[PDB]
Design a protein around this motif. Sequence first.
Motif, mmCIF file in Angstrom:
data_model
loop_
_atom_site.group_PDB
_atom_site.id
_atom_site.type_symbol
_atom_site.label_atom_id
_atom_site.label_comp_id
_atom_site.label_asym_id
_atom_site.label_seq_id
_atom_site.Cartn_x
_atom_site.Cartn_y
_atom_site.Cartn_z
ATOM 1 N N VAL A 145 0.867 -1.194 0.000
ATOM 2 C CA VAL A 145 0.000 0.000 0.000
ATOM 3 C C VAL A 145 0.910 1.252 0.000
ATOM 4 O O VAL A 145 0.813 2.096 -0.898
ATOM 5 N N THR A 146 1.787 1.349 1.018
ATOM 6 C CA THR A 146 2.644 2.573 1.204
ATOM 7 C C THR A 146 3.611 2.773 0.017
ATOM 8 O O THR A 146 3.841 3.909 -0.435
ATOM 9 N N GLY A 147 4.061 1.659 -0.572
ATOM 10 C CA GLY A 147 4.924 1.688 -1.770
ATOM 11 C C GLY A 147 4.229 2.032 -3.079
ATOM 12 O O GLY A 147 4.882 2.321 -4.077
ATOM 13 N N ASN A 148 2.898 1.981 -3.073
ATOM 14 C CA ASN A 148 2.081 2.182 -4.267
ATOM 15 C C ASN A 148 2.186 3.559 -4.948
ATOM 16 O O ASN A 148 1.831 4.588 -4.386
ATOM 17 N N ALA A 149 2.588 3.547 -6.201
ATOM 18 C CA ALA A 149 2.787 4.742 -7.000
ATOM 19 C C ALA A 149 1.742 5.835 -6.895
ATOM 20 O O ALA A 149 2.051 6.980 -6.476
ATOM 21 N N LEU A 176 -2.473 4.695 6.681
ATOM 22 C CA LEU A 176 -1.181 4.362 6.040
ATOM 23 C C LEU A 176 -0.275 3.521 6.875
ATOM 24 O O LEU A 176 0.277 2.573 6.365
ATOM 25 N N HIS A 177 -0.079 3.851 8.154
ATOM 26 C CA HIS A 177 1.063 3.280 8.913
ATOM 27 C C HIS A 177 0.730 2.479 10.131
ATOM 28 O O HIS A 177 1.577 1.764 10.636
ATOM 29 N N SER A 178 -0.483 2.617 10.638
ATOM 30 C CA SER A 178 -0.879 1.883 11.856
ATOM 31 C C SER A 178 -2.052 0.872 11.748
ATOM 32 O O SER A 178 -2.237 0.016 12.622
ATOM 33 N N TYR A 179 -2.805 0.961 10.665
ATOM 34 C CA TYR A 179 -4.017 0.162 10.494
ATOM 35 C C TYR A 179 -3.729 -1.332 10.574
ATOM 36 O O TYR A 179 -2.872 -1.801 9.854
#
Length: 281
Positions: A140-144, A218-221
């Motif tokens: 997800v976080t890496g997604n363009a 983004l980071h904790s879910y």
Amino acid sequence: KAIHMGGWDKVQDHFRAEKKDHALEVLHSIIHGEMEVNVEDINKIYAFKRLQHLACPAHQDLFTIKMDASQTQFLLMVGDTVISQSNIKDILNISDDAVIESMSREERQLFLQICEVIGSKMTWHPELLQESISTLRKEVTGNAQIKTAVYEMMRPAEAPDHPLVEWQDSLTADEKSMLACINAGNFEPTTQFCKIGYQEVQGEVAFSMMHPCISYLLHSYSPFSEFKPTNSGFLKKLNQDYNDYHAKKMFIDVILEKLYLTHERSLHIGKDGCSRNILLT
């Protein structure tokens, strides 16, 4: 990108190319140790996208998502018909009596975009989380386009790719204290700025903080149903920083401005080549 779930690698050979998407949707409904997961609400968002994509191109405007007056329910709308809804606390897998801060119209559209991507990874690539949350999240976080969308809203003039500027400490002990709240009461120069956005607008630089729902998602879910209260803890924390930052914005922005002007008009600050002051990577 290759879908593998349900033996799709070889199972797809039984279908005409024009039927493969229909057969996948069906395969998905057949198949979808293991921790219980709470993703029905969050998957609606990407599923609604799948619906929209099958409608005549000129009807596609008619499919939209809005909120109810309380902005606590997303309403999936096909013209004027509300086809389905989802509580935002259910989408977030958060414990219910948990406080959600409100989002601007911009922030909501971004939140929803992240919802689509997450929903789509969890739907077509269940192998991802079968490994770990971090493996799902990387994707997800890496997604363009998520990257691109997050930078466009928060740091429109900084490319996601922006190379770090080397930390030069001009902050007094009082300033570092004033900053503690935007990063959980710590002052670490390589991480202090990961939630801050900025844009220059008629000669002024305007700072912002990443909405806690967006940083949470983004980071904790975690989609896992069983840690509902742990998710909630993370959210309250991001809430707290967010609220501190706004209570003290007129002190904090003075200092951000000083840092931004002394780091080549960026807060993407690193030391010895090692930044985590990116919005996401």
